[PDB]
Design an enzyme around this catalytic site. Sequence first.
Site, PDB file in Angstrom:
ATOM      1  N   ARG C 352       0.814  -1.211   0.000  1.00 39.40           N
ATOM      2  CA  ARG C 352       0.000   0.000   0.000  1.00 39.40           C
ATOM      3  C   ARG C 352       0.849   1.263   0.000  1.00 39.40           C
ATOM      4  O   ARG C 352       0.412   2.299  -0.513  1.00 39.40           O
ATOM      5  CB  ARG C 352      -0.948  -0.003   1.197  1.00 39.40           C
ATOM      6  CG  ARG C 352      -1.647  -1.330   1.400  1.00 39.40           C
ATOM      7  CD  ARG C 352      -3.133  -1.216   1.119  1.00 39.40           C
ATOM      8  NE  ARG C 352      -3.873  -0.668   2.249  1.00 39.40           N
ATOM      9  CZ  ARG C 352      -4.289  -1.382   3.287  1.00 39.40           C
ATOM     10  NH1 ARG C 352      -4.040  -2.678   3.377  1.00 39.40           N
ATOM     11  NH2 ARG C 352      -4.974  -0.781   4.255  1.00 39.40           N
ATOM     12  N   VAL C 353       2.052   1.207   0.574  1.00 42.47           N
ATOM     13  CA  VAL C 353       2.936   2.367   0.543  1.00 42.47           C
ATOM     14  C   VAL C 353       3.336   2.685  -0.892  1.00 42.47           C
ATOM     15  O   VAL C 353       3.359   3.851  -1.304  1.00 42.47           O
ATOM     16  CB  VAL C 353       4.163   2.129   1.442  1.00 42.47           C
ATOM     17  CG1 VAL C 353       5.222   3.182   1.188  1.00 42.47           C
ATOM     18  CG2 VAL C 353       3.751   2.129   2.903  1.00 42.47           C
TER      19      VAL C 353
END
Lengths: 463, 463, 489
Positions: C352-353
């Site tokens: 997700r980063v």
Amino acid sequence: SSGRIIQIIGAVIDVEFERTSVPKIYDALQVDGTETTLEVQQQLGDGVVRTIAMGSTEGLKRGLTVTSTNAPISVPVGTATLGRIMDVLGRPIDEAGPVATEERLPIHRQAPSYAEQAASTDLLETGIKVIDLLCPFAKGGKVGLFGGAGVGKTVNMMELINNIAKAHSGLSVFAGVGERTREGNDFYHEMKDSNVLDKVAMVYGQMNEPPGNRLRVALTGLTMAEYFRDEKDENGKGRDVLLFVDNIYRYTLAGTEVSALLGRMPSAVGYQPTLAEEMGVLQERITSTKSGSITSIQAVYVPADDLTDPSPATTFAHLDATVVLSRDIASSGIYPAIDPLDSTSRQLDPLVVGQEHYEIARAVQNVLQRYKELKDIIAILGMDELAEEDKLVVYRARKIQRFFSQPFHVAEVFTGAPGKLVPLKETIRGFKGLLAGEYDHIPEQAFYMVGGIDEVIAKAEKL
Amino acid sequence: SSGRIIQIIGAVIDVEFERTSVPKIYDALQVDGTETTLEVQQQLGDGVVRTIAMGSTEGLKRGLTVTSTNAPISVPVGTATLGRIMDVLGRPIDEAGPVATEERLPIHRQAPSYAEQAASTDLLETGIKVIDLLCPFAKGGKVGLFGGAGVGKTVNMMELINNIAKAHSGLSVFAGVGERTREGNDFYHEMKDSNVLDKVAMVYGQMNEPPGNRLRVALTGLTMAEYFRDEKDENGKGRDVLLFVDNIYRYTLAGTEVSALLGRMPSAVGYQPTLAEEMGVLQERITSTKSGSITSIQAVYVPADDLTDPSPATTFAHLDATVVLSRDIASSGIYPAIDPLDSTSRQLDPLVVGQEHYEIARAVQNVLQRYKELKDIIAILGMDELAEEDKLVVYRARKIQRFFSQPFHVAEVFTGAPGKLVPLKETIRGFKGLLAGEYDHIPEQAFYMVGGIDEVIAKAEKL
Amino acid sequence: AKNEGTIVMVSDGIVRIHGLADAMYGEMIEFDGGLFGMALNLEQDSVGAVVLGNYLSLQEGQKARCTGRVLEVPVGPELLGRVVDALGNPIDGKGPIDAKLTDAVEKVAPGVIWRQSVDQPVQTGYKSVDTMIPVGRGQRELIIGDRQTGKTAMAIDAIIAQKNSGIKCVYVAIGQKQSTIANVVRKLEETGAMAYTTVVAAAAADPAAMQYLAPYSGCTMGEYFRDRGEDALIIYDDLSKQAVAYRQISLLLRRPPGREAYPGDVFYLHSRLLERASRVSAEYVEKFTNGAVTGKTGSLTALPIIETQAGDVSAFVPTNVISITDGQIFLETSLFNAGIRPAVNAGISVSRVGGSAQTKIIKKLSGGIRTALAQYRELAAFAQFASDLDEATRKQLEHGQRVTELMKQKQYAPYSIADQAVSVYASNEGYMADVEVKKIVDFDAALIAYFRSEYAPLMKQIDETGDYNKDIEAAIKAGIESFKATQTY
Ligand SMILES: Nc1ncnc2c1ncn2[C@@H]1O[C@H](COP(=O)(O)OP(=O)(O)OP(=O)(O)O)[C@@H](O)[C@H]1O
Ligand SMILES: Nc1ncnc2c1ncn2[C@@H]1O[C@H](COP(=O)(O)OP(=O)(O)O)[C@@H](O)[C@H]1O
Ligand SMILES: [Mg+2]
Ligand SMILES: [Mg+2]
């Protein structure tokens, strides 16, 4: 007038009061020397009640003295709560001093009665063309927004906040039910960077907090939203208020946790026997009444990608619309990244949305389906068969797919905060014209990052 | 002083003592006027302990008298136990008089510490093609055999004993836990017919015994092996030890049979809540330290042909080499029915066995995996539509699984054919030739139940 | 009288004490023989406690006392290169540990306002993970798969690849046999990575309380560095075994069970531990050190490990950890048995980063790998029907096969960012399309060896800066084209 602890097992505390003075259900209790809070849940006779701790429990012993406030949990309300961050008890955690107000309301209330229901059904405009055409929103209804594995949902929520505010401020409220702390920090920072922080009240319940907070943060946010709804202007009418909960699934997960902690017989899968009861009682306060309305946008995370589990089946009877996101389209360059085929809505009745709206939406979806089916045949054979047939659909659906693109106001990296808040009529007129064929000869690559038909016409005459 | 029996339920008995003479947790008690021994398990308060009988409880009544010994169960050790047969209590059952030693050791003790650990740095050959190629052994390591009922655990164990223990220079211990008495008698007479009875010690508790005997029978053999491991001679070095355990699963099964009567709550599929702890307590003692080494082979039973069951799943992490037998291979007439896509070993890395061995094993596994992948499309559809490489892969994989069969020495009674022993160099030669493609004209019938590739050539030519 | 009590029952490691009217929750309790306990159940008439040593020497009638303290472990830069148990007592036999500070084992995470976004990268040395599933400082990424798939290898390689980055590491072993721990320690010492690593060991023969409490003490040891302006990286080798030990302890205390007999608060157990890893702002560091440290931020990355049963990721325990963490790395048995090593499955692996935790050059380069792998994935069904396919589809299949072959790697052979950059740039522009599917690994190794052999300054500059401009691209292309001819594989 005061009781003493007699048992501490996990987060469940038993307090022994006198025979005459026994606190009622849902009362709030405070331990004498500590800063912890307990909420009564049952009465077991002989002046013994079973409570739950509103926070951490380490540092307690049998024999401490407990006093009762003779009232449920009360939180501050009003305009003074705008721009601040608060916990489930309404205390500030943003290091900016106390909240300057004196109006307090309980977080446990009854739903509006049968007569108070709004005497009409109306829709709510957002600004996003795809979600305004294929997934119409309902004023006061509920939106089930699922989809997305790594895509930027939080920036979409922020842009929805800004879009509704540009339409009408509405005094939105955010309540993160079990949110990642870093994501919450990012959301707060990005709202601060866009000066939209002056019209949003925020309640945070972290992942590592006891499950009671995970349940009650939504109640606190709902109480604040209700107070904002019941504020009337000079004309005498109320405000339309937006509410955000980060995940309904985590709410039911925490409810199952608490019910299992209190020693109850599990259900078919292992949830609580009162899943439907709690979900309905929460969901019956999110309604549109005579004065004002409350909407709800909530993320949905399907358990194990199964639609037969009770967890999404209970909610599906309450969602008034469905929205999904596509990872590949996000990687394809189209920033909104919404899959049209999966995303549908119940508000597509031709009587309310308009007959032209219905016809255009259905025809566009069918054309896109025709585009979807052609790729396999192209990969197998090619276009040798498809001559004078199915190619026109290819260009038409190419421009249709490119037309869903829209630049976003809050985002500044890829555009200079464009308005692009076109009315519905512009979108319906443009889709009708594109389906008819006046823009068939227009190049398909002029449809990227365009708001209206006049803008794409100006682009086409420019290139 | 002495206590008296107050309650008996099956194999579980509890005794009541005075407040000043309660025995310790793992003490041994004797029932006066009877040959019954009890081992304490728990202390329940008020001078009451809960014990487990080491025999049949028929003819036992409430109100008898019990005297304590203030010591755990002690068994004889040393060279006087070589060539003798003993039970769980260390008593001879071979009708050959008493044991001629005096040293005694308790059967309960703590595991060796972290500082006294050694690293196995020696390979060990067996003469079995599949095990040598795909799951090498290490001198001083742990080996386990996984399989269902009637798949060949005992036959493979006996063949390993024949190939290794006969050419050994040391001592051996054999422990029987819940197996057939006929097998024990056959093994004893087989060892006595030859002149290797003077190097082994046997402990026997079989499936006809009460759960108390089956619970603690492995600890006696483990204690004997431990004493033999840490034994030195004046101007004489230590001795290597081989240990054989039969169906270590019966130990956990016997633990399961008495869990409910001890007052616990079940977990998983009706298992005791202390499965992993009581497996690890026994497993951490079977090891090689700085002073002496132990090589062990164990047979693990898989209930209902379910490798996911908690007992084998917990057992999997305590071994260095794992051999898995499958019923599908056995039902096809291929012996030994060793599954080559589920058998691993820590010795299979290029730094230990060399480059060529590693490449051969990897290529064989890749071919087998590809054939298993192609099976479905081969089955439902035809075979003509396949690519030519796929046909070659299918033929090579079928020949490969034919070539992994081997006639054993101990299986001569079943088939009537003499056994074969294959050095691993011939195995590597044959498999490299097979993968190269030199034997693409040989029929697949010539690869069944032979030794080296030369026998394959001879059998094909004779055909 | 309020701090004295008598033992009543002793069974399975649980001791019931009569008295102790002033005992608190989680308070340490001392016994006569020198053993310590921990109150967990405060009933109306008795107290239930778990023993932190071995319970076989305790008998009814003895005495217990409350100490008015909580669990604490020594902290500081003296545990590096040491092996200790769950309570900080050394077990490697290298003398006493001289520490100056101790900290509590149960702690709360830093507030939301004290946090910061994640924009610094962490290198694991794997081409597959780094270029498609990047991990940043302060992130929480999960490694999940089946038995014997290579989770420990990935974690140990990630630890080893921090030789020059100067970030401390912690390794926690829960419910393993001591031989594997000794082998891992020996391998760590062989490569010289033991000088900045601490090992917390709770073996299979240890009591369930120690196996349950080890990760929190490891987290405190890791947090020591985060609270003072440095970075750290912690690894839990099996949270499933910790959950099993917690289930045993809960069932022995007669608490109501739920699905799969687990207690109600396993989700709380994992969440209140995994929420303690994050990045803090400079103001927090300034306030904590009282001005000793001025202009630096701290972080703590976590790499938990979860093992599934026959690839069933819908069980009770793995779903909670999947929901809690940001990303996941899935390893598959069918890919492992087919030669793909490591066995990363890119279909269901996310971060997700994203690109915010990457160097500039890798961020610029990974797009081609992503799109090529996606296009190859789009035609899985017709891989066995290559005769009946479009020629363009055939070329996409070819390039996807080439990339899939390129993605392989060996063990204990970490890659610096320069090596990945060179290989990915060579793949992207089509220099690898003229060789067969085989020999790709040999070509990659030969090219990397050549570049490291004669192009030292460029490699050092890319490794230390990570920039990307026209000059760097031109030099890389010149080197690659020089290798393409006048050299052998
Ligand atoms: N990249 C690789 N290339 C080749 N072999 C590898 C690679 N990674 C791991 N292996 C091998 O795979 C095997 C399993 O590795 P490992 O012990 O790390 O797995 P695991 O998932 O931790 O196992 P367990 O089921 O015991 O928990 C080992 O023999 C190891 O050497
Ligand atoms: N190599 C072999 N050749 C012929 N028959 C075999 C071979 N291995 C096993 N069998 C058959 O498989 C059966 C199971 O053997 P055994 O190991 O004694 O039972 P279990 O597998 O239940 O322990 C035996 O009866 C034997 O006839
Ligand atoms: Mg058998
Ligand atoms: Mg491992």
